[PDB]
Symmetry: C3
Subunit: 513 residues, 3 copies
Amino acid sequence: MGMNTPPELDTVLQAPYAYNWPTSKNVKIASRIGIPYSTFQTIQPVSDAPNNGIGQITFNQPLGNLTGGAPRLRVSFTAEIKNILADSSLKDQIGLKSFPVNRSIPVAVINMNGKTFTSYPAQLIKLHQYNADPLELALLSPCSDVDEYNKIKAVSMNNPYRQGTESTDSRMSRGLGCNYAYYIHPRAAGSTSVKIDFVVDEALVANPTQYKNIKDPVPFRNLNTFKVILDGQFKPENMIGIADDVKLVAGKADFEVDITGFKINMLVQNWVAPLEIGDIPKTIIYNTPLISLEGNISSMCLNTKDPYGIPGERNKHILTTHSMAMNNVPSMFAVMVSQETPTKKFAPDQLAGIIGLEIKVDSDVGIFRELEQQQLYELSSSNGYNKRFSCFSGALANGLTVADPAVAAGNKFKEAIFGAGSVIFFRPSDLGLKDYNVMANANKSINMQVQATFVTPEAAGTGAHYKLEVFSIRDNLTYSFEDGTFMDDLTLYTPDQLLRSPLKLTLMRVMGG
Amino acid sequence: NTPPELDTVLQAPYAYNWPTSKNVKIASRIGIPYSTFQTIQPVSDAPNNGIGQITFNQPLGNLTGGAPRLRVSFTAEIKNILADSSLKDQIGLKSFPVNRSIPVAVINMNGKTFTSYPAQLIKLHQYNADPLELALLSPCSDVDEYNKIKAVSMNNPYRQGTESTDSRMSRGLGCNYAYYIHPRAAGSTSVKIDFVVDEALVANPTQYKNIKDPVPFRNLNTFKVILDGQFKPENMIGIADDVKLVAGKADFEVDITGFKINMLVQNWVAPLEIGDIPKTIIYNTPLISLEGNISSMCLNTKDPYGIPGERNKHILTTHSMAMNNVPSMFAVMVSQETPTKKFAPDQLAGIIGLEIKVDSDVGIFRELEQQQLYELSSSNGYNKRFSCFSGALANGLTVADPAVAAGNKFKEAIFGAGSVIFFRPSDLGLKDYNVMANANKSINMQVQATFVTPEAAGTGAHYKLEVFSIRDNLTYSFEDGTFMDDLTLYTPDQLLRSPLKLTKLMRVMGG
Amino acid sequence: NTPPELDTVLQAPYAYNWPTSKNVKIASRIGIPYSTFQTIQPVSDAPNNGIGQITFNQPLGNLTGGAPRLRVSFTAEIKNILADSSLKDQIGLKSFPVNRSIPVAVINMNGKTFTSYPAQLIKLHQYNADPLELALLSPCSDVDEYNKIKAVSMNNPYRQGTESTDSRMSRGLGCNYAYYIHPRAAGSTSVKIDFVVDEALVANPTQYKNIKDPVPFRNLNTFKVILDGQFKPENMIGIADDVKLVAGKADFEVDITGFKINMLVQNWVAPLEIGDIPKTIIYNTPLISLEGNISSMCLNTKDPYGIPGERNKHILTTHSMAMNNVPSMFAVMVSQETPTKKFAPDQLAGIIGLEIKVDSDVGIFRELEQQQLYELSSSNGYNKRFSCFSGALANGLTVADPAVAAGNKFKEAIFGAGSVIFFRPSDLGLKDYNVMANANKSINMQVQATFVTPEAAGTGAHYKLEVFSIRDNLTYSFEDGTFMDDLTLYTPDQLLRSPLKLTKLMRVMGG
């Protein structure tokens, strides 16, 4: 159009940091203070642990001065696995499920100085495993690898039950002899069972623990009342993994597994604040996100076409939540469609493959209707989703095996493997709402409805119940006052305050988002 | 002399930076939405077999994503497969199959055309980009290390998802991209596979180096993307070298049908909170050019799998290459001109020596051997292992086996894929201090490469020495609608007096 | 109590930090050249079998690279291999084979000598360095997790390149280093392999912790590198534990011939644009020393592959170790004194308890169990999996198999390689607050380690407890030519009143 010339730009010479010569003008020498490993507490529960891992477990241990921000639970037990075909090698076929400690705790209550925090570790970790940093996840649990597909076989190389000697990268393995202590009892000739001792030391994922910052969590102060109350569900379906190609004794449909000798301790650092940090501030703030199930709905999903057939012909099931009333705007949402009832106890968890999503917020309807599955994967990945597309999609993963004419039509289904399925993370900012007041942390009431279209792995002429769940992740802070009091509260502001807040495009801490 | 006094600090964990009202702020958020995400159809029906011009013509208001993608879908039928072949872990796609299929692209923004060469760009870019970025660019981001792929071997990019612990290593089925294998009949010698690939377009001015968070384009009243579509099997389809052929057939025959292509890009209205957008927005849009090439028929007289020091040492030297200004980086590779198989890894020669002339300064790098040339290239981002770069014999035991008769040693030999050597003007240590990246000084360059090739004793083939320049180049978006692009050029004196950058809203481009 | 008011911000993508003339600058570049790269020959012909003193003596003008490397080449002949052995994925090199081969090194810069112990240094450093830096240090950077390597198992560093998806995992052929296997005759029981390895020298004052971008040395009128060369098979050559032996032979017999060694380092003139080089340049050059050791004959009476709680718990306690100042870090290791096989992984014991005494403070860490000791070591950089650290039985199914006779259970058992525990004085939580890293305060320390060993019931072997110190230590280059080095020591009172550092041209050394 007009007269345009590129603007003048100033120049610099990019040079290696090696030429920033170290001298007396730019070098200082450090000594060090740090969190010690002396007086590291091993805390027994108030009563002898339930011998099979099932029941309430309470830790009650006042602790003076500073306490580690990411306390851990150390569990030990013996698992007896029965109904194994005689003469089975079991090589690379036995291990633990992902995050077996937190999977085993449906609800936890933590009391600090009379303030109780109720959370749901099994629900929390099922989401968290999919969009956290995998480096933090390995600090959280020795069993941090997340299943990509709905079956695991020792014949396949992507096998989390490969033992340590079969694993080049330890983070890939939930198997024996790799990240956790174990002992296999001697097996008799002709035996159809095995006993394995396990020990697992895993960070507790329960508000207000600092499970997102395991290397360097902010300590707690002066826990004069400190109780950790667990709904203990340390049972085989929560903890134990068995490859889908282990053969069964004639006449048995699944393995029978028993837990005995269950023990549990809470392990946490405890220490006196060093002289050099001076006065600890009166009021300490902790980032303690609040994860909530906002809505759910289920249906019986019947397939009439082969799930291993042409992908575009797989039955497209739809579920839509009831309207979900919220008093404020969360930071993030997560959508997943879960198989309600596992058909096997020791196999990967099954989710549906979500192929479409439509969101209504207030009067704004049909949001994301133009997205297909690859774009939904991109959306979720933009918010941290950390697994491959073939997992997310729920597609048929082993098509050659199923396209084989030597596999009779009847056995094609039995041999088919699918992606584990979808979790879709989205923020209110992803929705492009015309209502600019709907911002994360706004104290504005909203109504949301979620429609998910999805595919399921059941055979043609069969079905199963699936549940659409919509979770919120809210920014939430815990406050430690100098007199001992703890409080927690959502970080809420008016839309007008947020609209006028300065942009952040890149010792100050910024929490929330 | 006495050591100087140094001040002391106490290193302490960040845990002791206690969060309080003095040092904590709470964020809300704005971001780029996934609503009104555009799926743009071409102006006319795509060629059924992927061959032909393809045009997108779609004005877009307000803000448009900086890294638009192409979603391709098609069926490939692979014929001449020995009956009763399992095909397990043997079929997939070549690296960056969408960009490999586009020899030339023209993008028009508001009347300004940008012509680039995606296939040429990605062949180079794949070797020194950040592998994390490459995985965001394409689902098929693993780059071959060796000149043959076999399902009997564990380094196999056609291992399917259930055989791959790390998805980034696989270009196979059931891992990073959607696929469907049609049922196979007893005794069949062919397979049909549906594929879908969503890959970022690598064509100026797209922001393919910043896929997570690219700077958007604005007010695209004219937006055209014109592709030379060459979505043919040799550009897209990979077949392991140990799949067996039907008797009498020299190679597989592959046909593409059902080809469809859409351009996918975000589009949205600027949030109220960012206020006015600046009058002139600047985009980093590097310009990659072939500066010179030369070829020869290279004949081997000694076994390429024999003593490495006895491998024939071929030499190619470019003609003098006249440049009007000094590029930021150069890349040297020696390519096998004619593939002997259509669905196998690309073959480069193993470069064992390099000598550079710039103006009157001759023989630069003559004292470097192959390990040092690997170190040089790696210091400029080269991202593969030494046994790839070197082009050396990779499976020495197999060839040393006395049960493998002399005639079959050649057929069984596997070599590194070969070399790409990235170097900057600053790597040359030129006595002429005026020869600096982005200087508006004319120079003349000649490149000599000494290299080894994988052909059998008593055979040969044509190899081409290519020297590429990578120049710092910027695109300017003026608020009146105009787009321009230009090299970033300065006098040597300007550059010689510029301040050093030895290490947050400030952006530094070029280098 | 009421929660405090907190200010708010809007988190926004960096894409909205629009690049404009107000926030963009354009870089040219200067860098460290690859021209005049020195390949320095030893003053006398290298010892043909790799055993003997080796000296490099080469004055260098201007700037010299801070991380010089050694390029070794040799042929290894391996004898006593069962006839018709494939050897597939069974031969390679041990971790850091060059530094493993140098028990002591002396470097002279302008008349100042620095004496260090590379083999001792690398045995520690491999366990808590950044693995990305370790791969720049040596092509053979993977560290053994278990005490046996078998080609039947996937965690096998002698996997060749074509069997390795990730090159950093492999110390095998055809992956990270050049090699050539000589043709093998029918019925032969030996193999000859040529190797070439280019590895950074780990010897004070080399900048081996910063290989990508080390600070250069300047104006070396005297530059000598004097090595105790022990480039012998037990230091360099790895052979999988499932390679079979010819009848009547107990171990392989390996010979090194044709040994050559050169020192490779960049050398260049300072660019005009950095102006004057400072009068005194400081280099971080940590001092690693053995502070104490003690040994015993450790006899096992229970099966090491039996119930873990019943494995014999061996205890070693050092004598009192007197130190004149407080080191930054300690490392505790219990080593098998005498290898039973020459080409197998190094064996350490599994440490299950540790108790530390410092001055009058006794029994520190007595409440920690093995998992907590692993966490402690990991907090200070320990970089391997728990099953390595623990020294536990790694292959319990094999041992639990009733088809494996009680007599063969031991032979088939595989254990973790065993423990290294890194700890800092700050980890000890001492009531004496004067005991701080770099304090010029005398202390006395005693270390007790409780550990398990892999020997069969009814047998034993000697184990040595070693406690190493890592001290913060600086080298100073004065422009008159003089070099000095010295510990960085301060009074406790100086350190106690020093400002906290809780979190770019400023450099902080030590810690």
